[PDB]
Amino acid sequence: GIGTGFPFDPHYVEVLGERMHYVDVGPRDGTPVLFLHGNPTSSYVWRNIIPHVAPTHRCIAPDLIGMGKSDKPDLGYFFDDHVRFMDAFIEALGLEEVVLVIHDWGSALGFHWAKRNPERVKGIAFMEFIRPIPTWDEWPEFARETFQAFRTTDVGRKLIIDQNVFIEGTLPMGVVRPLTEVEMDHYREPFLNPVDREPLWRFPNELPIAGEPANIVALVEEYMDWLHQSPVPKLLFWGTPGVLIPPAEAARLAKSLPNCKAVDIGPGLNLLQEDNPDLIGSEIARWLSTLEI
């Protein structure tokens, strides 16, 4: 069955006065592969992708500030906060050139960093990524009223912070196959205390949809503009019906973005790594062998 364990030794690095945890496996030389998770996950989401790549490539998978095994300071956990911390993480590890493997809010981080530092990004593998969604009619019908409620400070915080609905409900509803109790406990662990749930609520409130919030929409449009021109090698994974990326949008993107290969993973919602890790990991490994890295 799909693996439930997380066998990786913990590594920690001080970043802007805070400790961040990261996975670091694979050979020491060569261009490293930097895996960035999103909401509400951690490096745990990459646990069955990394073993396909770690035979021949260094794999680095941080836990975002406020998440996983990373420290959880009293921040607002705005996207800008995550940018500051991941900028500093990459610099703290002394990374030069990288290949990005990114998902959900990790893709916004990876795309925004790559747009700012294109000489250092030798390829981008991405899936269920942050795009400027033009209308709420593009959001999956079965989840529409709830995600609109999440974007308030009263019902939204009751649901996500007080009642933990993003972990107990939204997370399983973003995976086609059923998550085991062991897997659910791995996702629950960073967030046992309600006061640590701020990122879980701020991330859906940063989601750029129907023009709100305007500053995030502008930032995401900027990196999409870059992605539509840049020759950087691209690998897009998509599933059906998806959540952030409907299958029609994934097709359109695969045909419009330069130097892009697209892989249909089958059934999938948001956590594509939880529905077809074997294909995602094996296709990243094969694609990496075609890059000049």
Ligand SMILES: CN(C)c1ccc2c(-c3cc(C(=O)NCCOCCOCCCCCNS(=O)(=O)C(F)(F)F)ccc3C(=O)O)c3ccc(=[N+](C)C)cc-3oc2c1
């Ligand atoms: C076990 N089990 C399958 C479930 C399933 C459902 C529930 C529900 C429940 C949940 C929803 C609900 O979550 N609807 C929304 C689904 O959304 C799916 C698409 O997203 C997938 C992930 C996409 C992430 C994107 N990242 S991201 O946001 O940063 C950005 F920004 F997009 F990028 C809606 C209604 C209900 C309900 O039953 O009332 C509960 C509600 C309350 C509750 N109390 C204890 C009070 C417990 C619940 O127990 C459940 C367990």
Ligand SMILES: [Ca+2]
């Ligand atoms: Ca080409």
